[PDB]
Design a protein around this ligand. Structure first.
Ligand SMILES: Cc1cc2nc3c(=O)[nH]c(=O)nc-3n(C[C@@H](O)[C@@H](O)[C@H](O)COP(=O)(O)OP(=O)(O)OC[C@@H]3O[C@H](n4cnc5c(N)ncnc54)[C@H](O)[C@@H]3O)c2cc1C
Ligand SMILES: Cc1cc2nc3c(=O)[nH]c(=O)nc-3n(C[C@H](O)[C@H](O)[C@H](O)COP(=O)(O)OP(=O)(O)OC[C@H]3O[C@@H](n4cnc5c(N)ncnc54)[C@H](O)[C@@H]3O)c2cc1C
Ligand SMILES: COc1ccc(OC)c2c1c(C)cc(=O)n2C
Ligand SMILES: COc1ccc(OC)c2c1c(C)cc(=O)n2C
Ligand SMILES: [Zn+2]
Ligand SMILES: [Zn+2]
Lengths: 230, 230
């Protein structure tokens, strides 16, 4: 009574396991009466590159191009490309941002990396002052829902990939905490592709299940100690 | 000596501090007699999105598109888009791959993330099985030359950002080591925007200076302990 949720989704295939997970999040959150909006990056052909096209009108310095400066000023002067400001409006309205993506190289797919690079701009998402605990997005929740190719076992302290929390750091702390998000525990669906079709059926159901009480949840302590420590 | 180097460069502005580090690498390795190639990703308008456009033949499963499966097959059949195979030929021929980039959200800019997602495909850079010390690019070296907005002090274990090595993990270990590269110690040029003009000139010459004896360096132990301590 009531909540707004943005799902930033990065998978090429609607019939994929990621697509199922995005669709059960939409179904469950809509059923609870939440306002839901989805940014389907691939379907939108979302631009991942940080270029001077991201500024309309004229550059606060067309001699030397500096992306961060130009986008900081463009933001303040309402001169950012509309793909960007369409996304920032969705984020500004959201109480929760859920990112749904397969892990690509211990991180997000480039198209979703480009969303963070280009949407979470200085003045919108952070400022002096206003990072970490005081980043401009404080008040909001963010949650990573990741699928992997490697098994839970590979993702331990002394498994081949190291601990899941190791790759989460740049996303949870370096990006989401930096901006002021309180970060909920990641949802990780380990290795769907090596089934079973029913164990999959089941990982979907657990995600839906968890979305039922998502609003009761406590944020993780987003710390060096949480990700690396013991 | 008789060595081939590929620099993968990701900055929009030739007069930038990244541009200067890239040029000094080129000047110094060329002076040594090395064969040098640069992939200047922004200038190439390098495509970062992993889509079905990257395969030109009949898809192995056209009903449900799986980028990893379809590119693995495409690589074996030689039906990958030519921008990808152009980069693969550069990598295949290189003895050392240097990545030169500003840190973006604790990671590489999206356009370079897209290079890693699309160029390092299954069959070319790794196979399952055939990764980490068995990865397919064994015998090659890689090095990250990264510039930051944050100062060295901010990137320490007790600094706001955590230790600099924490954000290297997904790139050094999860991508480069996974593919079989031996990783040389990163070159991190801290906060050049803050540094004085002579400190900048000094950071440029420290890189040029290091490159004088690069072929004598040993790789780092690319393990959790090196990155996280403990
Ligand atoms: C989307 C985004 C995300 C970011 N995320 C992060 C992050 O997670 N962590 C973080 O720490 N930072 C982050 N930053 C900021 C940071 O990485 C960059 O600002 C960058 O590393 C600075 O490098 P540059 O080449 O652009 O510097 P420039 O601004 O080009 O360098 C300062 C310059 O010295 C220059 N110069 C060029 N050549 C020379 C030379 N030969 N001698 C002396 N001076 C020279 C220019 O004259 C200019 O004054 C982010 C920035 C953006 C836009
Ligand atoms: C460039 C790249 C880099 C990568 N890097 C990494 C990495 O660093 N680490 C790592 O661990 N992995 C990595 N991977 C592997 C990748 O993370 C996994 O392939 C991906 O997460 C699988 O998720 P998906 O949605 O694509 O699964 P899918 O293959 O689409 O689905 C698994 C199965 O579930 C089925 N399905 C669809 N809907 C449902 C439903 N409702 N219920 C049950 N089943 C359903 C599908 O049809 C399929 O049979 C990488 C892959 C690529 C292409
Ligand atoms: C390209 O990277 C991968 C592609 C496919 C994978 O499994 C299908 C990968 C991985 C990685 C990095 C780790 C990893 O554990 N797995 C399991
Ligand atoms: C978008 O992230 C940044 C943009 C600009 C920055 O400084 C110029 C940043 C940062 C971060 C994350 C850390 C950080 O320490 N700095 C210093
Ligand atoms: Zn944090
Ligand atoms: Zn390693």
């Amino acid at each position: 009574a009531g909540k707004k949720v943005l799902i930033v989704y990065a998978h090429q295939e609607p019939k994929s396991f990621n697509g199922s997970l995005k669709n059960v999040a939409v179904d469950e959150l809509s059923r609870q009466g939440c306002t839901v909006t989805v940014s389907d990056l691939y379907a939108m052909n979302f631009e991942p590159r940080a270029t001077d096209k991201d500024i309309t009108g004229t550059l606060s310095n067309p001699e030397v191009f500096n992306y961060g400066v130009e986008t900081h000023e463009a933001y303040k002067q309402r001169s950012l490309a509309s793909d960007i400001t369409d996304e920032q409006k969705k984020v500004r309205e959201a109480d929760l941002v859920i990112f749904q993506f397969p892990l690509y190289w211990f991180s997000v797919p480039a198209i979703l990396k480009g969303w963070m690079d280009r949407v979470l701009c200085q003045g919108f998402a952070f400022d002096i002052p206003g990072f970490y605990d005081s980043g401009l997005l404080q008040g909001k929740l963010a949650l990573l829902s990741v699928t992997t190719g490697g098994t839970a076992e590979m993702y331990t302290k002394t498994g081949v990939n190291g601990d899941s929390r190791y790759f989460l750091w740049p996303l949870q702390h370096g990006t989401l905490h930096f901006c002021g998000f309180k970060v909920l525990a990641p949802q990780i669906s380990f290795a769907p592709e090596i089934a079973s079709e029913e164990e999959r059926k089941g990982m979907v159901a657990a995600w839906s299940q968890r979305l039922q009480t998502i609003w009761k949840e406590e944020p993780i302590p987003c710390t060096a100690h949480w990700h690396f420590g013991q």
